[PDB]
Structure 1
Amino acid sequence: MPRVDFPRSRLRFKEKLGEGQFGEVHLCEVDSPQDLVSLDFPLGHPLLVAVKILRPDATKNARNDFLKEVKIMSRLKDPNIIRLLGVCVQDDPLCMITDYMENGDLNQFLSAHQLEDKAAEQGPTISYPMLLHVAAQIASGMRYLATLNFVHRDLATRNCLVGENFTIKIADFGMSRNLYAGDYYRVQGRAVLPIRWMAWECILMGKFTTASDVWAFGVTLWEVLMLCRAQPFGQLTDEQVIENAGEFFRDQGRQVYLSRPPACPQGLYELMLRCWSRESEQRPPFSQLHRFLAEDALNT
């Protein structure tokens, strides 16, 4: 990656999207960005971008994590993955710049919609083929990550972003959001794990693989067909979810699965169940999941 800062002077401030312990997040406009970034430009208006601004008196520890995040993000270039557009690091304050997804994270997007009813034909609605199109984009992005030997480790709707025309980009917001605190279980010090999205081997042995990403995709797809109305295993405690992973290990018929979402076709629930195969090698690859869902989306 070239060591050339994005020009701060090309970031017109529009709105503060969030504030946190070590800085703020701003929404900005960049006029005629073709000379600065290379993109599949969305439809002569300025390009919206998100900017995380590290606080100017950030600790060395915070700066180090900031730099490492830039490094991880710099290698990700795919239509269904969030894109690092640039950074400002040669002076304070440290800035990183991504593309902007106007509809926010996928959990809040689907929480505001209802499934369209064909035997009842007044908030916004979404069709079942469109839910399949969303899931197919997620699988497409995860497929790309798999080709990089990149294990996401925290796939869930809360880490998927929604742009125009239902475009989905996978992201990772860490633990910078109090909204989803209930989705994480504290194991050691400040480290937390999203156990309800994690495969049994992740919970019991800490084995995070592409195959465990497939397990998380099954839960994420479950969220999408639930329109994010309920936490996975919502009426079970964290300890009980951890027990459930031990029953996948025990393998004597006591493990439990997420139920088939209302109106979810049996074939799609069967796809989820293969993602939750006890043996990681029996879980479908993301290329198969993408192919299944992309065809199912067009044949529905």
Structure 2
Amino acid sequence: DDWEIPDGQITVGQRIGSGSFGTVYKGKWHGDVAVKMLNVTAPTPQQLQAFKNEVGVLRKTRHVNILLFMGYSTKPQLAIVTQWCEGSSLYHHLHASETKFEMKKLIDIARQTARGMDYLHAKSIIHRDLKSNNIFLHEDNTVKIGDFGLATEKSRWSGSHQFEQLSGSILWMAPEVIRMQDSNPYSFQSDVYAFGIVLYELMTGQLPYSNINNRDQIIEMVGRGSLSPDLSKVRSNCPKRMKRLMAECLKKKRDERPSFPRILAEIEELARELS
């Protein structure tokens, strides 16, 4: 295969992070790359299948707003090679750094994120974990959507042990995803809900549910339909179109949420109005 990179070519440099996703390094290969390695010793069946699936998903993508897949290696380690992203995630900017973006820039971040997601859905790819920490602000001018924490081990059990491991994603999980009444409750429409929460973050500067003190309460109440983000907390310069669009993306009945083509078109119209 054309995207396999022979052993010896990549210089694997600094370790950036390790976790349930494997280990990510900065590397050199015709310039800067990121290298995600999924095993150290002989890979398990699970690891091999996770690697094959991730390469298969990524190889379907060629879009400016989706992390650029570049290649893979299989020996001595399973490795997925992509572009290097330079900067911080949207989550890090908004919630860890007190970055103060101008509204035109908040809308551009929304617009680029919507382009990437519209593209994914056109390629029949449900992201499954859209959230502001997976929206990379590369060189502070380009959004790159990735899945920067994809767990290699998948649980077999549709259960409440899942919520610990997915604690970093609870705020972006649609109500039907929380309730898990289907064995795989993820859809294009659950990605749209997550995008609604991102809109909330951009237009309020805050995470939803900031006054709820524990995750179990969020899980219970969002599941029951008794907790919803406080939309009144949008900043005074929030455009009217964004108030409407955010409420539509957060609709409790999944089939009432708008599609990404419609979301994108609305945000493109807004951006034109502000320019």
Deviation track 1:35-77 (CA, whole Å, cap 9, x = no partner) reads: xxxxxxxxxxxx3211113443154133332232222222222
> What's the Cα RMSD here?
2.6
What is the distance in 2 between the residues matched to 1:52 and 1:256? 36
- Asked which structure has the greater RCO (Cα within 8 Å, sep 6+), the reply is 2
Indicate whether 1:219 and 2:197 are aligned.
yes
Q: Letter of the aligned partner of 1:5 in structure 2?
A: E
Indicate whether 1:62 and 2:36 are aligned.
no
**Cα separation, partners in 2 of 1:291 and 1:51, compared to 1, 3 Å:** same
Deviation track 1:233-266 (CA, whole Å, cap 9, x = no partner) reads: 1322323223333443xxxxx5533333333334
Deviation track 1:154-197 (CA, whole Å, cap 9, x = no partner) reads: 11011111212521111112366xxxxxxxxx823686363321
1:1-300 superposed matches below 5 A: 2=1, 5-20=4-19, 24-31=23-30, 47-60=31-44, 61-89=46-74, 91-110=75-94, 111-115=96-100, 126-174=101-149, 187-188=160-161, 192=166, 194-204=169-179, 205-206=181-182, 207-227=185-205, 230-236=206-212, 237-248=214-225, 254-259=226-231, 260-263=233-236, 264-300=238-274
What is the distance in 2 between the residues matched to 1:267 and 1:23? 41
TM-score after normalising by structure 1 = 0.75
Residue 154 of structure 2 aligns with which residue?
Answer: none
Task: Report how far residue 129 of structure 1 moved.
Answer: 0.5
What is the distance in 2 between the residues matched to 1:102 and 1:288? 30
TM-score after normalising by structure 2 = 0.81
Gaps of 5+ in 2: 152-158
Any idea what SS the aligned residue of 1:25 has? Answer: strand
Deviation track 1:216-235 (CA, whole Å, cap 9, x = no partner) reads: 100011122344xx432132
The structure that has the greater radius of gyration is: 1
What is the distance in 2 between the residues matched to 1:53 and 1:114? 32
Task: Report how far residue 13 of structure 1 moved.
Answer: 4.4
Gaps of 5+ in 1: 32-46, 116-125, 177-185, 249-253
What is the distance in 2 between the residues matched to 1:153 and 1:59? 25
Any idea what SS the aligned residue of 1:256 has? Answer: coil
- The answer to whether the 8 A contact 2:21-2:150 is kept is no
Any idea what SS the aligned residue of 1:278 has? Answer: coil
Task: Report how far residue 21 of structure 1 moved.
Answer: 6.9
What is the distance in 2 between the residues matched to 1:256 and 1:5? 46
Q: Letter of the aligned partner of 2:228 in structure 1?
A: V
Q: Letter of the aligned partner of 1:157 in structure 2?
A: S
* Identity between Structure 1 and Structure 2 (%): 28
